[PDB]
RNA sequence: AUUCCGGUUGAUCCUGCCGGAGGCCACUGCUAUGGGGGUCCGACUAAGCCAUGCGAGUCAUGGGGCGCGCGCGCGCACCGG
């Protein structure tokens, strides 16, 4: 139904497009290592259909700023966005607007077309089980003034870290993880976008082909 | 749970301090059915002052006497340990 609606109402205007249209890529996992650009949210929607559910597009802040003039002040609204498969795959944005449903497109669009892989296991000391529940080692990241450095955790430890790092952990598929942060967590931005990254980093880590079968390494979705 | 949130601008990112949110101890406001267990109750200021009663005796198988009942048995003080 929503397959053949999405892939049959949409001409594409990319190259990316035209293939996962015509069916040359069908999984979501052709498009990453390559040094595609990715320029409409119609490939994710294809390929990742669980991105659409309201359940997977968390809202995370939303802003008022001001431009003044010789007359007065020209209001403006910012809205900052998550989406995510809750089985590897996330993705954040940002959309400024004049109203928050245009805000909240936009940045629901952009957080479509930025999305990134992960990996995932086990890691701990306390745990050492092969079941991808949390990261397989530690990770840093920053954003501004803020330094974020992610451990991993046993399971039934739930998400010791602030409310955006839950969300976005939460929607990345992690659910076990220890944390310790330095500097301004107070701008959600810049929080969010370093939990980001230290995400991002769990593959500019090297890794010996024993490591995976010790950590349980998953690679994208699992099974 | 190896956690955060509010506050300096017409709007932003920092630095930096104040505050919130947890536990334990003492005093106190309002209110209060039951049982069990425990190493709780004039310590913080005055190691300031004290009415009254009690908190260290015992030995007759160490000694002499005195009283009470049929040499013997009970009771009292003293010497002595
Ligand atoms: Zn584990």
Redo the contacts with the bound molecule.
Sequence with gaps: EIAQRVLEEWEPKTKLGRLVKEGQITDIHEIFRKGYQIKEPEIVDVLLPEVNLRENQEVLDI??????TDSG?RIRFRVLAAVGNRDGYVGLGIGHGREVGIAIRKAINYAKMNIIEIKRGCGSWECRCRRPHSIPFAVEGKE???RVKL?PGPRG?????????KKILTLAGVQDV????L?????????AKAVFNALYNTNRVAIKPEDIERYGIVVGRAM
């Design positions: 802003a008022l700023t001001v431009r003044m002040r501004g003034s803020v451990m430890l739930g998400l010791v870290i602030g409310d955006v790092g220890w944390s310790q942060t500097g301004e967590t107070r701008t959600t931005v810049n929080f």
